[PDB]
Amino acid sequence: GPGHMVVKFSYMWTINNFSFCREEMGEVIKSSTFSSGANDKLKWCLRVNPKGLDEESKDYLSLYLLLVSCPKSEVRAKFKFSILNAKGEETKAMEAQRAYRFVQGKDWGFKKFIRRDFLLDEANGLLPDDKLTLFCEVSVVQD
């Protein structure tokens, strides 16, 4: 039966002067809004907790996709997060295994996205020049 093409798009977010303390960064960091295009009526953004906000995730950085604005009832979207290293390569990817149902104001993400001590280990190259660069790929689907 006829349907709609999968709508794929991406967003790169650079968080400068990344630090591991509440002062300097605050508990919730928010990205600018993004979408697939100009004619797109949906508005998305990312939100990071540099330290997870519960006991289970306190040793991790958390990362979420938030649907800011949508006119339609709901949106089904599959999403994938990764960290870009200094070569521009994706690393430490974490991906939804199915599409999740989004409504205006709903977020979906990973409270245990990456361990803080792994991020801070300079051997891992994920904070070159104290900059965390995150890359989000989204597929808006009918499924």
Side-chain angles (χ1 to χ4, degrees), residues 1-38 40-71 73-143:
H4 303 106
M5 187 186 80
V6 174
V7 175
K8 297 173 66 168
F9 56 102
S10 61
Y11 178 69
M12 187 182 47
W13 179 24
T14 297
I15 297 154
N16 283 92
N17 307 122
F18 188 89
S19 78
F20 301 75
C21 309
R22 258 261 306 109
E23 68 278 354
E24 314 168 29
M25 300 238 288
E27 275 187 342
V28 180
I29 305 168
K30 183 163 125 139
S31 80
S32 295
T33 55
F34 61 94
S35 59
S36 70
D40 195 343
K41 245 51 163 202
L42 314 177
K43 296 316 185 225
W44 307 84
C45 68
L46 304 178
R47 299 206 287 207
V48 158
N49 309 127
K51 170 164 184 109
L53 301 185
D54 59 21
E55 172 69 18
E56 184 182 324
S57 62
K58 65 177 186 322
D59 298 330
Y60 294 72
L61 172 147
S62 311
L63 172 60
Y64 295 91
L65 175 59
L66 169 75
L67 181 63
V68 175
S69 323
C70 91
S73 39
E74 70 189 44
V75 181
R76 293 197 77 102
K78 181 158 149 85
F79 52 92
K80 168 176 152 189
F81 305 125
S82 60
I83 306 171
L84 301 188
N85 65 19
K87 300 165 185 273
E89 291 161 351
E90 307 179 9
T91 194
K92 294 309 275 199
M94 194 166 280
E95 181 171 20
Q97 293 312 294
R98 57 153 167 112
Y100 281 78
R101 193 179 144 271
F102 285 83
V103 297
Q104 188 155 320
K106 203 146 215 191
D107 65 323
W108 283 106
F110 299 108
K111 75 176 184 190
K112 296 206 282 142
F113 174 55
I114 186 147
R115 292 194 47 106
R116 281 156 57 72
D117 55 21
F118 191 97
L119 216 46
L120 171 96
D121 190 345
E122 292 201 68
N124 296 323
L126 309 186
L127 293 179
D129 299 339
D130 279 334
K131 300 173 191 158
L132 177 57
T133 294
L134 300 168
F135 189 56
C136 172
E137 298 162 271
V138 183
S139 298
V140 170
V141 304
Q142 253 71 25
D143 188 345

